[PDB]
Amino acid sequence: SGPIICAGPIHSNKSANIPHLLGYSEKICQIDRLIHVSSWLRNHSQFQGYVGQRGGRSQVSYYPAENSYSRWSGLLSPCDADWLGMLVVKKAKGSDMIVPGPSYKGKVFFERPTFDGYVGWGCSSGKSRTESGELCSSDSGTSSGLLPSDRVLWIGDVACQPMTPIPEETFLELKSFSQSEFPDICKIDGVVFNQCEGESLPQPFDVAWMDVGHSHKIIMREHKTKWVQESSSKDFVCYKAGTGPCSESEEKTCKTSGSCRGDMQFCKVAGCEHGEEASEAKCRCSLVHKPGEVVVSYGGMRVRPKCYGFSRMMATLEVNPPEQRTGQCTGCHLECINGGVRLITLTSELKSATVCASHFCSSATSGKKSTEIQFHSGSLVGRTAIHVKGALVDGTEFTFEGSCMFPDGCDAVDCTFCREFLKNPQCYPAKKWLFIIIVILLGYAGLMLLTNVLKAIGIWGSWVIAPVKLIFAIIKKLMRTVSCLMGKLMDRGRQVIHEEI
Amino acid sequence: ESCDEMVHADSKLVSCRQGSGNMKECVTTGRALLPAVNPGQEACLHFTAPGSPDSKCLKIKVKRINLKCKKSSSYFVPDARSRCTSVRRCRWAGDCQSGCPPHSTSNSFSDDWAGKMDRAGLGFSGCSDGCGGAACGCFNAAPSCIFWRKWVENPHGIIWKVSPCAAWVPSAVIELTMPSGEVRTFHPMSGIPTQVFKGVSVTYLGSDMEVSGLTDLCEIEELKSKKLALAPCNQAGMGVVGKVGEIQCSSEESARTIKKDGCIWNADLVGIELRVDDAVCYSKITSVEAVANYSAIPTTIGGLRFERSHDSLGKISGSPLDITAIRGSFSVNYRGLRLSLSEITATCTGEVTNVSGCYSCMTGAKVSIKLHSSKNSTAHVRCKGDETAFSVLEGVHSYTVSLSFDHAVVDEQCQLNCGGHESQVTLKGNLIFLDVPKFVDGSYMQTYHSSVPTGANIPSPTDWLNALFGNGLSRWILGVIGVLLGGLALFFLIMSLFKLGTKQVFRSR
Ligand SMILES: *[C@@H]1O[C@H](CO)[C@@H](O[C@@H]2O[C@H](CO)[C@@H](O)[C@H](O)[C@H]2NC(C)=O)[C@H](O)[C@H]1NC(C)=O
Ligand SMILES: *[C@@H]1O[C@H](CO)[C@@H](O)[C@H](O)[C@H]1NC(C)=O
Ligand SMILES: *[C@@H]1O[C@H](CO)[C@@H](O)[C@H](O)[C@H]1NC(C)=O
Ligand SMILES: *[C@@H]1O[C@H](CO)[C@@H](O)[C@H](O)[C@H]1NC(C)=O
Ligand SMILES: *[C@@H]1O[C@H](CO)[C@@H](O)[C@H](O)[C@H]1NC(C)=O
């Protein structure tokens, strides 16, 4: 859970040397003692002393606190990678601000990965960070010459590893694609990203990022990862019992020589041999605890990244004052052709309009420029107060007024109910005479065919079939005169036959 | 400058005052039952004071009486795509041993996940089993663990405003005015008040004209291009899969960018299937632009033409086809409105100039009068039939009023008075008859006329001939005899030649 090669150092010198070793195993043994910070301080910051007082590496505080990539030990921090030979950490710059993260009181040095690279901040001897982090305040507490491990801070969670380079052609297509995800970010830490002709006050935002090594990194929002154990040729670092790491010559020979005691995982690959031996183990070891190496599968093409992290960052947001409006129309005018107004629009076409007449309303046909609107025919007399309201395309709302002249006492109907109550104008004044003449002519030749009926009655022809039914009714009535004769005769005869006694 | 449907308001409830250089001032509480009248006219609330010889009016004017809808609730629907992320591990570390160690997944069990950001949206973390071994990239011959997270995002940036409602009760728009100088327009609904503006609340009572077919239907309206439609939708809160309303959100500040909090969504919309080593997901959501019964701006559902009206509240209106009728009424409730009375009499005299217009019509007859006044009082022109009020100005001016007559000649006498100077005027003119308007193709009406005159449509004497004949009692008889004689001889003289055209078909050719 953090102890990789050995326990925590103690140190005795007030100002020692830290000689540079050549063995990679010796290097990985050295990292666990928290010496990269000391090398970064004694080389450039001029500070004399040592960091990580009997605390080791696992006790370094993290701003995320409870976070992944920390329960393991094989992951490489950016400082370890930098001391392993990758890109040099840039010096502190006055144009880079500090994200308002955790409390900085009591800390002595921290680092932050930016868009261009990685930066680090610290103070000289006898000074420490304040609660905010603008200046180094002198404190008597940091004067005993010993600095505990918790005073070194790291921001965000990161994993860095060797990567396979790619041609630039497959990289640029990423940068454009990542720029289509956020049409809001314009400038990040003074680095152009888009063209918005306007900035705003930068605000912190926490995102993930992927490092390729060709340009100013890549911002990550959605992506699928894949952990691969690999462990092909060189993934194991180890030591001896108590003494520490073995010699460089032993490490070089162990991969090619014969009998080399070790874990069965290393045994199955190295080419180990077995035989009678004693307690003379030749740097026996195993495989270092780490999940492996990460790959990224962004929409098709895949790439192994140099670094992979999640942290806070400084950026701006686009701002635009779109509130301008337009007004209403541009010199529209209202006409009146026949029984209805006619709207005219010059700026653009008409989407929908609602004409309000004296005692009616109507909706425009919509679609054209010089639209025509017709009301109900029959009642548009007198002087009106036409009032229109509507909206055009491209977001404009327009209202207008106006009027026109319409017939006052003109109706102009041919033959309906509108005339019989009005014989005074009735459109053509010399028109009632036609009605009078026609009606009197029809009245005279609608009574002439009544005297013919009166003198020659047409029902006498039907007076020949009714007497037929009367004859049948009479025959039915006189039918009954026979039964009252025959039955009575039979009854009288039967009575007379039996009346003799 | 006109009025109609007087109610004379209510007196004896006013409480008089005094001070500040005349201007008696008053406060009143009461009620009224002004009629609805047709859209275009106005009904007023002529006030009175027991002592002062001045009055102030309160007129209600209606423009549109359309069939707008109610509003149970409102919400904002954003369009959403589907996004997914996946992470593969190997069974070598001390973090995972076999799938999910507990009964159910808790928190996220890992960092870097796209759920700690701001634009991520709602998510559902899950774990599953995938391939493991030498062929896949693990050092253990056991199935590996796959951790997947699914969410939704909103590229573009459209936003839909939805209001589920099935009432469709008649409504109207009115232009209320205070007595002094104020004018404000608002829209009452048939059953609910319209809030207190300055002490006057006016509510409408309709007839509840049922529509033919209208199930649960919601008016949806885009907020970028302003495109309106009617589509089925569910009530606020619960989201049933199938209709619009699955990405329910309430605030147009977190609707464009979907946030974890602020609104509620359902599951089974971003369903994820696991591959051999990764995870890819496809959305089952349906955009609101095509769901079911998605209509457009012009529609003819039932017997009502649902056009689009340009207002501030309820921007979807129905409309009848030919004329139709709705019999409703307003009910003004005034609580603490204040009115100022001059308490000074002034000269007021005038006479009419001309009358013209309709018979018993839908608009009445306009009468134009000319007045010479030295005050700001309100006239009270009254007659045998209707009565009207308006506002007179300083100096000499002319005004027009609407009076509804019944016969084809006007000779009545009025009793015009403004302030304190009751006098007499006269009337004179001729009027014509114009019937109810017909229907003509190409016109889409958008109003519910609230009154139609019928039952007095018959031909009449003593005017059927005044433009046909002379003018006089004996002239009528002389003209009748003349018109009877004018044609009898002509008709009965053609009898001689009638046979010449009648017997050709019945005799030799
Ligand atoms: C910190 O100081 C040490 C001490 O010189 C530097 O170590 C040197 O590294 C170079 C190349 O890596 C070697 O050629 C030298 O032999 C090293 N010096 C010694 C004394 O062994 C180290 O490079 C410095 N780190 C910096 C400047 O970032
Ligand atoms: C470090 O300590 C050793 C003795 O342990 C001493 O010889 C050496 O000079 C010290 N290094 C210094 C003082 O730089
Ligand atoms: C949509 O139209 C179909 C057509 O028949 C109808 O049956 C259905 O009820 C309509 N949908 C809704 C939600 O009313
Ligand atoms: C009626 O009088 C008014 C004066 O206000 C005048 O404008 C109008 O033309 C007159 N109309 C007729 C028909 O005399
Ligand atoms: C009377 O009315 C006119 C016009 O409406 C106005 O200018 C004037 O101020 C009014 N009189 C008073 C005393 O306010």
Author numbering:
A (entry chain A): 21 to 521
B (entry chain B): 561 to 1069
Passage from the reporting paper:
In addition, domain III tightly packs against domain I to make the structure in a compressed conformation. In the lower part, the Gn domain C adheres to the junction region between Gc domain I and domain II, and the long membrane-proximal linker loop of Gc inserts into the cleft to further secure the interactions.
The severe fever with thrombocytopenia syndrome virus (SFTSV) is a tick-borne human-infecting bunyavirus, which utilizes two envelope glycoproteins, Gn and Gc, to enter host cells. It has been shown that Gn plays a major role in binding the host receptors, which induces the internalization of viral particles into the endosome. The acidification of endosome further triggers conformational changes of Gc to enable the fusion of endosomal membrane with the viral envelope, allowing the viral genome to enter the cytosol.
